[PDB]
Amino acid sequence: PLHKYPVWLWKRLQLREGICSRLPGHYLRSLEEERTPTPVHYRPHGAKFKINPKNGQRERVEDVPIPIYFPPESQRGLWGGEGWILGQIYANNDKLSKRLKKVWKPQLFEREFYSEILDKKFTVTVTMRTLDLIDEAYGLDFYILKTPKEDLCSKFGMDLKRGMLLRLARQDPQLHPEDPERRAAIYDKYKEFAIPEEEAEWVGLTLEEAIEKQRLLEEKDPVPLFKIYVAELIQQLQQQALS
Amino acid sequence: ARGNEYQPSNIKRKNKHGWVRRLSTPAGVQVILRRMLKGRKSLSH
Amino acid sequence: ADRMSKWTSKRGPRSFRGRKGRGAKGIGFLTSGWRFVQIKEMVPEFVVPDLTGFKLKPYVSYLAPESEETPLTAAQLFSEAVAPAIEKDFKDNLEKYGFEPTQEGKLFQLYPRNFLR
Amino acid sequence: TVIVERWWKVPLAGEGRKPRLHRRHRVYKLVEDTKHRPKENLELILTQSVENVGVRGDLVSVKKSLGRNRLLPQGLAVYASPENKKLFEEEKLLR
Amino acid sequence: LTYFSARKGKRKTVKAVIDRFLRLHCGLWVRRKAGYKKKLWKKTPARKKRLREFVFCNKTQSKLLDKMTTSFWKRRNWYVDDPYQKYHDRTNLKV
Amino acid sequence: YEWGVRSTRKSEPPPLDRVYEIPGLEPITFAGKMHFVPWLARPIFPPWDRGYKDPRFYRSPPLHEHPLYKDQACYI
Amino acid sequence: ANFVSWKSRTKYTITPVKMRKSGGRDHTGRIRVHGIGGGHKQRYRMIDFLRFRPEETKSGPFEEKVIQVRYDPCRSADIALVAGGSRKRWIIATENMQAGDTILNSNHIGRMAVAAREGDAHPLGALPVGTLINNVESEPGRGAQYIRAAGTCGVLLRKVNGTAIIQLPSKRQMQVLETCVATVGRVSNVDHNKRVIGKAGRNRWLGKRPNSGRWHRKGGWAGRKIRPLPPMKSYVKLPS
RNA sequence: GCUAAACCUAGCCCCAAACCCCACCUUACUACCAGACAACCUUAGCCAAACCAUUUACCCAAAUAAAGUAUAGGCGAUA
RNA sequence: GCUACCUAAGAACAGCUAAAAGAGCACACCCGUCUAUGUAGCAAAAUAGUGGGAAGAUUUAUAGGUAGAGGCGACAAACCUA
RNA sequence: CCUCCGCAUAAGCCUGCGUCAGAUACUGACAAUUAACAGCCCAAUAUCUACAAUCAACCAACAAGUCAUUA
RNA sequence: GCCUGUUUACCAAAAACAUCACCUCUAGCAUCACCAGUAUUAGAGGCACCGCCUUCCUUAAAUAGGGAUGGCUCCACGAGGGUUCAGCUG
RNA sequence: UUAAUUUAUUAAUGCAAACAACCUGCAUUAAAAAUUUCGGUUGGGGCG
Ligand SMILES: [Mg+2]
Ligand SMILES: [Mg+2]
Ligand SMILES: [Mg+2]
Ligand SMILES: [Mg+2]
Ligand SMILES: [Mg+2]
Ligand SMILES: [Mg+2]
Ligand SMILES: [Mg+2]
Ligand SMILES: [Mg+2]
Ligand SMILES: [Mg+2]
Ligand SMILES: [Mg+2]
Ligand SMILES: [Mg+2]
Ligand SMILES: [Mg+2]
């Protein structure tokens, strides 16, 4: 027989069912939407069309991303979209030679970063690319708040994003307590990234974490039927008395 | 001389092919899953 | 080599045969020297009523009239047990009517059930 | 960062379709390793006097190592962002 | 050759044939002579003249090439200034 | 020379999830699930109090707190 | 494999410890060292190789009484149960150490050279040049690691600045801070060389087993060979 | 005339449509004590190339057509 | 769960001779020299006699470990469920 | 007339010559192995424990031999 | 072949492998093997205990047997491989 | 194996990278390997 739906649509169908359906709409949209990460390990084509020299004709060109492997250690650090390149090479760089398995790994450093919004220093395993990205963003907080999930590619990065966004959304006085002017200065500096707290609560959550959060939100010990029946009987008696 | 390679002992049988040892590794879990898919009456030993 | 027969306590070596039971609920514990201490409270005490003068019998006369099955429900129990008092006190704090906020503190807790049968 | 390139060209996938990769498309050649590029300089605005660099409010091109290890972590300098440049310009014109 | 491709189920063209032979529409195949560019300094002028010529193929060679190419290569092409336009057709041929 | 090789010493607990280092947010742990899952944060369980009290599951207090403990060391 | 090292005891003790044989096997269960297996069951006596270990709430040089000198199954040297103050410990016995002898363990680097009596431990700075020593540390307080086998004896070759040159029994020179402690004299059981095993069974008792396939590389053992250079290829195997 | 011989539905195949009490991870099916190990990481090769060594189609997210075309390729098998 | 090696903790080894023994003769036990039988056999390696060892580098029960280009091997390319 | 046989434990097996009724130690039904033997243990924390065995007394050694208790 | 042992489970038990003994090579050192060891140690390879010096006879007939760093020395042992006296025997 | 092809992996170095350790990339040399082959004629083989 045949399945009614293609097997690759089964995850989407599951998302449209059960507790995953009760998940908030903005989070579901964030999961569903997929954007290609910024090129890191390959040089993108300049344009969509190119004059190939062999025949001098205008041919379409596409940027096919290199498959990158992110070891679980990366989720505890901030690699600027950089990861392991698991691929193959031709020995001596000629196709008529042997084909060898080759793994390119990034150079990882341990660095300490201070987050203004969190008023905390984090020691993070990092790459030179991540340092450059932080410099381009003018600080760790800006880098975390600007970089989308795909380019950030770090569970720790997305947790930092959620923390900063929650801090901004709540305007939490725990940021430099006893220094309200400094706290307001920080919030004003990072004002443009502020989002509603109901949305910031779900930023960077994996699907399983979001399911657990929703289950905790909607878990309620059942109301005893005594209370329901008492309320119903009192309402009915009120109606009878009025009529 | 040969043929009696089976020298039974329930301790060895359970420790070698039992449910707990099967579940102790992902490969053995897939063993049990294959037996369940086939419909084996005896999943483990 | 027998994969199909049920695993019982009759099958393994001495340690296996001693360790496995037959479903009987535990009655106590084992101390040093394998001395078994039997806890009285762990032993199910049969609460057998006095049947002297009881009129009901194992069977019912066929002369009894037929009736329609009406399984008891929470709504029916509330109506027949709480609704009268509720009405009489409303015409004139739910613990007075029987409701208890929590089962903790009771001997026979309804959930999680902590009594036999 | 290691930058690689396919030896074998990938056929065009289309508009909404995704490219289909085969065994030969996993063969890469290293076109460049960014770590071997010549070092560039970081633009920073100083906040406190620092020996042999500057005093305060002056844009300085410092080695990235110094900028990221000493100046910025210790607060001796701030990123040369447009906002920081504007603030220090107002400071200069108010002095 | 591939009689049924794995992606379309179609018959494939041996591109080695296309890179080497010209098909006149009537069914004639034209080719260059082997070695026409090789070691010309040691070849007599008559041999070089023979080698510089465009030459027809056998009936069986033509049949093989027809089998090795698909119908696309056997169509009428109305190129602008094709040097072989006059040769694309046969005239005054008896059987 | 120290006695007791590392491989026999008690294994160091796994590093805490980075989610616990971020001040403003409550980590999502498998405490609510009442069982371990590998894709959720590991809960920080408060120490359990009713444990070392039952006679058959008793833990003696440290020697310092015993009634007859004395700073002067007798030789028995 | 479910291998846990037997070396799990944390507190020093005089009681011999039940040690598990390895058979030459890793924690992975595969043979790592060949030729090991079986032999007489042995108990391990924890040796205190830090001779200058003043007792708790105590300090300074201390003396110790040699309770006894015993054969040790786990060593070529025989060991000495030695007691000081209110503690007992196993140490490596020197050549002429006897029951009832007295041993000095000092950390005092005297300005003059201390009279080197066999068996006592002094910092290498305090010993005369040319004295025979054993149980030599590499760093101050590290614990003895060198010159520990039966009958071995290094020589205090030189002392300059805070550094002493020791001649190890392999006749190799070693540089050690003069504050590191060593004991005077040669290690006991000096006749360990002259012992004749006599029969294969005695080695089997000692726990050495005949083992083959000791290399596990393709082709087994292969001695190193000189690979000729291209100019020399013409003369490698000149026929007669 | 023995052994046999015969039978027709038990079901199955391909489509379409539709999205589908108690016990038991310890020696499973075992009422009832100090956890913490908790997962992630290119398929390879057969085979074709009449050997083989680069190479040799493989759930793709609209069929058809463009088109076995452009391209790729020990520029060859083939893709 | 055979076998090879190893780990933990067991067990067995009469009698005589000799005297603390990889000692002698020789039971149990282990093996397998030679011969015969058997050769779809009792047996996919057995039987009978003979023979070697038999307090040791011995034999052996139990549980555990090492896994396939790997293990293990007192090297026979031996053994790792005929 | 014959037997390194037998009886027990272990391990293994799992009702596999008990009774009855039908068949030619098979089928079905009914029955049965009763704990003292054996297994299933220990409330912990600390701290303790050099001194073999071999009739363990002499003699004899080397291959140096778990015995874990107490406040 | 020093010896006791080991081996081709199922055609080879041996002179083969191991083995004490000796030689060579490698390694100056800690918390999972080696090793809770430390050059009189550990790992690997070789070699072989040890010790020393540097034509005749047999039969009557005998292709059989025995005798006139290496070279040597066989104490003992062997279901090893040859030869022999005597005896015994279908 | 002094057949051909490699060095992916380890081990050394060297150069860059991160400021000695550790680690990444690129080279060179080895170890260990890996993959693959065995033209034709002459009774066979050697040398031809
Ligand atoms: Mg067995
Ligand atoms: Mg298209
Ligand atoms: Mg082929
Ligand atoms: Mg005897
Ligand atoms: Mg003997
Ligand atoms: Mg063996
Ligand atoms: Mg051989
Ligand atoms: Mg021999
Ligand atoms: Mg022998
Ligand atoms: Mg054989
Ligand atoms: Mg034989
Ligand atoms: Mg003869």
- DSSP annotation string for G148-190: -STT--EEEEEEETTEEEEE-TTS-EEEEETTSEEEES-BS-G
Q: How far is A224 from C101, CA to CA, in rounded Å? A: 9
CA E3 to chain centre: 21
Q: How far is the C-alpha of A187 from the C-alpha of A169, rounded, in Å? A: 9
Phi, psi (rounded to 5 degrees) for C76: -65, -45
Is A13 strand, coil or helix? helix
Tell me, yes or no, if A228 comes closer than 8 A to chain C by beta carbon: no
Residue nearest to nucleotide I71 (CA to C1'): G30
Using an 8 Å Cβ cutoff, are A182 and A190 in contact?
Answer: no
Domain G107-187 adopts which CATH fold?
Answer: SH3 type barrels. (2.30.30)
CA dist., res. C1 & res. B9, Å (int): 10
Q: CB–CB of D4 and A66 under 8 A?
A: yes
Residue nearest to nucleotide J70 (CA to C1'): F76
A89 CB inside 7 Å of strand L = yes
* Chain L, protein-covered positions (CB within 7 A): 1-2, 5-9, 16-19, 23-27, 31-34
Q: CA nearest D26: which of A68, A64, A87?
A: A87
Chain F touches chain B, with at least 3 Cβ pairs below 8 Å, answer no
Distance CA(C74)–CA(C81), nearest Å, equals: 10
CA distance A83 to A125: 13
Would the CB atoms of B45 and C4 count as touching at under 8 Å? Answer: no
Sheet with D59-63: strands ordered across: D59-63, D41-46, D77-79
A226 to chain C nearest CA, in Å? 7
Chain K nucleotides near the protein (CB, 7 A): 3-4, 9-10, 17-21, 27-34, 36-46
Q: Are E55 and E29 in contact (CB under 8 A)?
A: no
The range of the structural domain enclosing residue D46 comes to 42-95
Helix (H, G, I), strand (E, B) or coil at D63: strand
| DSSP assignment of G100-121 | T-EEEE-----SSPPP--TT-E
Q: Distance (Å) from the C-alpha of residue F24 to the closest C-alpha of chain G?
A: 43
- Chain C residues in contact with A227 (beta carbon < 8 A): 94, 99
Round to a whole number and report the distance in Å from the CA of C25 to the C1' of J16: 33
The residue type at A39? P
- d(C-alpha A168, C-alpha C107), whole Å: 51
Do F7 and G5 lie within an 8 Å CB cutoff? yes
Cα(G205) to ligand 2 centroid in Å equals: 81
- Residue E13: helix, strand or coil by DSSP? coil
- Give CA–CA dist C6/B45, Å, rounded: 11
Nearest CA-CA distance, residue C21 and chain B, Å = 17
CA E26–ligand 2 middle distance (angstroms): 34
Beta carbons of C13 and B42 less than 8 Å apart: no
User: Residue A136: which residues within 8 A CB-CB, separation 6 or more?
Assistant: A143
Q: Of B6, B11, B45, which has the smallest distance from its Cβ to C13's Cβ? A: B11
CA C19 to chain centre: 28
Map out the domains of chain G as residue ranges: 1-106, 107-187
State both tokens at G230.
């291209």
Q: Supply the DSSP symbol for D71.
A: I
How far is ligand 5, taken at its centre, from the CA of residue B1, in Å?
A: 29
- The Cα of C35 is separated from the nearest Cα of chain B by a number of Å equal to 26
C72's tokens: 């008891």
Q: What SS3 state is found at D83?
A: helix
Q: What Å value separates CA C15 and C1' J34?
A: 21
Nearest to E39 by CA among E47, E29, E27: E47
Nearest CA in chain A to C102: A224
C-alpha span between E94 and F6 (Å, rounded): 100
Amino acid at E48: K
Ligand 9 centroid to Cα of residue F7, in Å, is 46
Q: Structurally, what CATH architecture does the domain formed by G1-106 represent? A: Beta Barrel (2.40)
G214 CB and strand K closer than 7 A:
yes
Q: Which chains touch F (3 or more CB pairs under 8 A)?
A: A, G
Residue G119 backbone phi and psi in degrees, to 5: 105, -20
Q: Which residue is nearest to nucleotide L24 (CA to C1')?
A: A107
C86 interfacial to chain A (CB closer than 8 Å): yes
Q: How far is the CA of G199 from the centre of ligand 5 (A)?
A: 14
Give me D78's structure tokens.
């701030």
Distance separating alpha carbons of residues D29 and D5, to the nearest angstrom: 5
Beta strands per DSSP E along A74-152: 85-90, 99-104, 108-115, 120-127
Angle, alpha carbons C61-C64-C68 (nearest 5°): 130
Calpha distance G50→G91 (Å, rounded): 9
The residues near A202 (Cβ < 8 Å, ≥ 6 apart) are A24, A26, A27, A30, A210, A213
Distance of CA G21 from the midpoint of ligand 6 (Å): 19
CB A110 within 8 A of CB A126: yes
Retrieve residue A144's tokens: 């975390």
How many beta-carbon contacts under 8 Å exist across A and C? 28
Residue E46 host element (H or E):
helix E45-51
Provide the 8-state DSSP code for C46.
P
- What is the Cα–Cα distance from C41 to C62, expressed in whole angstroms? 44
SS3 G82: strand
Q: Considering CB atoms only, which of A118, A174, A216 is closest to F32?
A: A216
Q: Which positions ≥6 away from F61 have C-beta within 8 Å?
A: none
Please give the resolution of this entry in Å, rounded to 1 decimal: 2.2
Q: What region does G141 belong to: left with phi over 0, alpha with psi -120 to 50, or beta?
A: left
How far apart are the C-alpha atoms of G92 and G74, rounded to whole Å?
A: 12
The Å distance, Cα G200 to ligand 9 centre, comes to 14
Contacts of F1 in chain G (CB under 8 A): 49-50, 143
Closest-approaching ligand to the CA atom of G201: 5
DSSP calls for C28-62? EEE-GGGPEEEPGGGSPPP-PPP-TT----SS--T
Mark yes or no for CB contact B42/C1 under 8 Å: no
Query: Residue A33, CB half-sphere, CA atoms under 13 Å: how many?
Result: 11
Burial label, A78 (beta-carbon count in 10 A; 0-12, 13-18, 19+): buried
The CA–C1' separation of C21 and I37, in angstroms, is 55
Distance from CA of A219 to the nearest CA of C (A): 17
The three-state secondary structure class of A88 is strand
The gap between the terminal CA atoms of chain C, to the nearest Å, is 40
Quickly tell me which residue has 């402690």 as its tokens: G181
Whole-angstrom distance, CA of residue F22 vs CA of residue A120 = 8
The amino acid sitting at A99 is R
Q: Do chain B and chain C touch with ≥3 beta carbon pairs under 8 Å?
A: yes
Distance G209 CA to ligand 8 centre (A): 19
Phi and psi (nearest 5°) for D45?
Answer: -110, 125
Q: Is the CB of A10 under 7 A from strand L?
A: no
CB contact under 8 A, B10 and C12: yes
- Cis-peptide into C71, omega within 30 deg: no
Name every residue in A having a CB less than 8 A away from some CB of D.
40-43, 60, 62, 64, 66-67, 82, 85, 87-90, 93, 95, 99, 102, 104, 106-107, 111-112, 114, 127-129, 131, 135, 138-139, 189
Q: Do the Cβ atoms of A118 and A190 come closer than 8 Å?
A: no
Does C13 sit within 8 Å of B8, measured CB to CB?
Answer: no
Are the CB atoms for G50 and G140 separated by under 8 Å? no
Q: What is the total residue count of chain A?
A: 243
- Token pair, residue A170, equals 């709540």
CB atoms within 10 A of CB G35: 14
- Is the separation of the CB atoms in G67 and G39 below 8 Å? no
Residue A196 DSSP code: -
Alpha helices of chain D — where are they, by DSSP H? 64-66, 82-94
- Residue F46 structure tokens: 């408060």
Strand L within 7 A of G238 CB:
no
Q: Contact, A102 vs A50, CB < 8 A?
A: no
Interface test with A, best of C90, C93, C95 (most A CBs within 10 A): C90
Residue of chain A whose Cα is closest to the Cα of F15:
A76
Kindly give the pairing relationship between strand G79-84 and strand G181-184: unpaired
Q: Could B11 and C16 be called an inter-chain contact, meaning their C-beta atoms sit closer than 8 Å?
A: yes
Say how many Å lie between the CA of residue G211 and the centre of ligand 9.
20
Mutation target among B4, B7, B10 for the C interface, most CBs of C within 10 A:
B10
Strand partners, A114: A121
Q: Which residue of F has its CA nearest to A170?
A: F24
Ligand nearest the Cα of residue G220 is 7
Strands (E), E1-95: 22-23, 29-31, 55-56
Q: Is residue C81 helix, strand or coil?
A: helix
